[PDB]
Design a protein around this ligand. Structure first.
Ligand SMILES: Nc1ccc2c(c1)c(-c1ccccc1)[n+](CCCCCCc1cnnn1CCNc1c3c(nc4ccccc14)CCCC3)c1cc(N)ccc21
Ligand SMILES: *[C@@H]1O[C@H](CO[C@@H]2O[C@@H](C)[C@@H](O)[C@@H](O)[C@@H]2O)[C@@H](O)[C@H](O)[C@H]1NC(C)=O
Length: 536
């Protein structure tokens, strides 16, 4: 003070922040970027739960994105937008526990509903600073307060020797919880309403939102939840205590760390961060798709039991959730090492490649279980047809990992109190750089929900701009009221709740909302009711 914009000075519990007035297409928004919310988790704090940020003096500059959490950089297709857009856009550091706030400009006069975004990336990658998570459009067009946080990924976030003090597990989830606490204490300073906080997230972000729903301390920190293309139940989002111990111990051996828990973790704490990242992928029990080395653990603490036990016995009377999937959940995963598949050709595969693909996609399956999958997905009229085999391989991955875990989740919640709305997102961005065969891949509804197409410089179609406006309106209506439908609007077709009785959900595309029934019901009976029994 006291030259300098007076609408950009805010005090939080830790001291003064100076934000930055950014431009959105329709007008200005306030951004407070790189606010630290924890003591840097470095040195003797690696693998430890986060400690709250100690207060500072002077004005903290909150005008730029801060460091991204240490992680593996994707180099499948170097220079290719389709992969590069998910890669870190700030330097990598273990000092990375910072969050971001976008608010209208000037800041809202009455308490506004808050959306908190939790990025995905297999629990090994992601950053809140990526272009596709820019909160400026929701802030400007919908008047939302939007917050997003960095949380520790990979080993730093999730390496666990369960039972130990030095490496308890789930610390990445604990980072996210600390940011939720920081929102409760501080968000009013920005004109947000701590009594109206909605969590939303996609992929591992979605599974995280889910874990917060199933964890007691978290439940008093938010009111409503959105889970896009991910769930806490299912094959990849968690691991048993035993399995996490196994993986931690193997990684320790692989980097030279040999023999009780204190010694082992102390040695790990002296290894360069990059060394851990360089070995991260070597601890998986089988060759596999849609599996990640270091993920939330079932510790009997953050997670008192498996997500499955918790969804089946929890009381969800007070909860409102929006859940959904994209048309082609599996397709992107196939180019990460499934033989026969690529972004540069049509990936027309053979029957042999489809069976080999299934062993990889369902790694936990016996010979019998795998034959069951293959038989179920074969087109018996054209069983050698390479186009169908390619689409089948895709659907096997997508159904087993996302669609059917989502279906089970929606079903259990609705059955046990929750108001649940469900969607399938079916529009392929006209600006998409992946080939057509991949359809609508994992992650490609995000840029629409966040309103990117409203940026004229981005080259989306006019109808796409209107489409993003609809979606932003649904997401923010849901944040505001627990119901995505416009209360005043009469002309627009209604989005009904999902129920066990009727199993209704909506198509999200360029055409007006169509109500559909049964979310791959038949096939999800195979994956959710039959396959588990067969694995015995
Ligand atoms: N060159 C290879 C070949 C085989 C394997 C390799 C790499 C990698 C890999 C390791 C380090 C860095 C990058 C990749 N992974 C690790 C996981 C790979 C999963 C890739 C897809 C994904 C899913 N969630 N996060 N990501 C990482 C990339 N970020 C994306 C994200 C999203 N969507 C997409 C869609 C298309 C391409 C990328 C992508 C949406 C959410 C967030 C991230 C595999 C994992 C396996 N279980 C098997 C094979 C391979
Ligand atoms: C499609 O591509 C897969 C990956 O191979 C890569 O791309 C092709 C176009 C070649 O130029 C190759 O040298 C690259 O490494 C192949 O494994 C697969 O066999 C291909 N399938 C068909 C049907 O052509």
């Amino acid at each position: 003070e006291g030259r300098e914009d007076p609408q950009l000075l805010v005090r939080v519990r830790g001291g003064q922040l100076r934000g930055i007035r950014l431009k959105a297409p329709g007008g200005p928004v306030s951004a407070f970027l790189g606010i630290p919310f924890a003591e840097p988790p470095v040195g003797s704090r690696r693998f430890m739960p986060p400690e709250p940020k100690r207060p500072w003096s002077g004005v903290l500059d909150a005008t730029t994105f801060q460091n991204v959490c240490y992680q593996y950089v994707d180099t499948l297709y170097p220079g290719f937008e389709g992969t590069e857009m998910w890669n870190p856009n700030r330097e990598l550091s273990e000092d990375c526990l910072y969050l971001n706030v976008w608010t209208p400009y000037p800041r809202p006069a009455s308490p506004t509903p808050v959306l908190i975004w939790i990025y995905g990336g297999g629990f090994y990658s992601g950053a809140a600073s990526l272009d596709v998570y820019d909160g400026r459009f929701l802030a400007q067009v919908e008047g939302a307060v939007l917050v997003s946080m960095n949380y520790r990924v990979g080993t730093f976030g999730f390496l666990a020797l369960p039972g130990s003090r030095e490496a308890p597990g789930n610390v990445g989830l604990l980072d996210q919880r600390l940011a939720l606490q920081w929102v409760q204490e501080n968000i009013a300073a920005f004109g947000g309403d701590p009594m109206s906080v909605t969590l939303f997230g996609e992929s591992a972000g979605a599974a995280s939102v889910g874990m917060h729903i199933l964890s007691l301390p978290s439940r008093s920190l938010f009111h409503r939840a959105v889970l896009q293309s991910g769930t806490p139940n299912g094959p990849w989002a968690t691991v048993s205590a035993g399995e996490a111990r196994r993986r931690a111990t193997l990684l320790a051996r692989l980097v030279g760390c040999p023999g009780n828990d204190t010694e082992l973790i102390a040695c790990l704490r002296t290894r360069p961060a990059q060394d851990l990242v360089d070995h991260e992928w070597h601890v998986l029990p089988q060759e596999s798709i849609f599996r990640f080395s270091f993920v939330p653990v079932v510790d009997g603490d953050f997670l008192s039991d498996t997500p499955e036990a918790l969804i089946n016995t929890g009381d969800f009377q007070d909860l409102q959730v929006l859940v959904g999937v994209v048309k082609d959940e599996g397709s992107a995963f196939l180019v990460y090492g499934v033989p026969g598949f690529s972004k540069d050709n049509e990936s027309l595969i053979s029957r042999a490649q489809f069976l080999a693909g299934v062993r990889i996609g369902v790694p936990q399956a016996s010979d019998l279980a795998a034959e069951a999958v293959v038989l179920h997905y074969t087109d018996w009229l054209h069983p050698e047809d390479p186009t169908h085999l390619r689409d089948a391989m895709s659907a096997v991955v997508g159904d087993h990992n996302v669609v059917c875990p989502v279906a089970q989740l929606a079903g259990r919640l609705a059955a046990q109190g929750a108001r649940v709305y469900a969607y399938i997102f079916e529009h392929r961005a006209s600006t998409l750089t992946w080939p057509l065969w991949m359809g609508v891949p994992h992650g490609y509804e995000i840029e629409f929900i966040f309103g990117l197409p409203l940026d004229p410089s981005l080259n989306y179609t006019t109808e796409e701009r209107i489409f993003a406006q609809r979606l932003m309106k649904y997401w923010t209506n849901f944040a505001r009221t627990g119901d995505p439908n416009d209360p005043r609007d009469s002309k627009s077709p209604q989005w009904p709740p999902y129920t066990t009785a009727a199993q209704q959900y909506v198509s999200l595309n360029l055409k007006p909302l169509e109500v559909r029934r049964g979310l791959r019901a038949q096939t999800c009976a195979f994956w959710n009711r039959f396959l588990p029994k067969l694995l015995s």
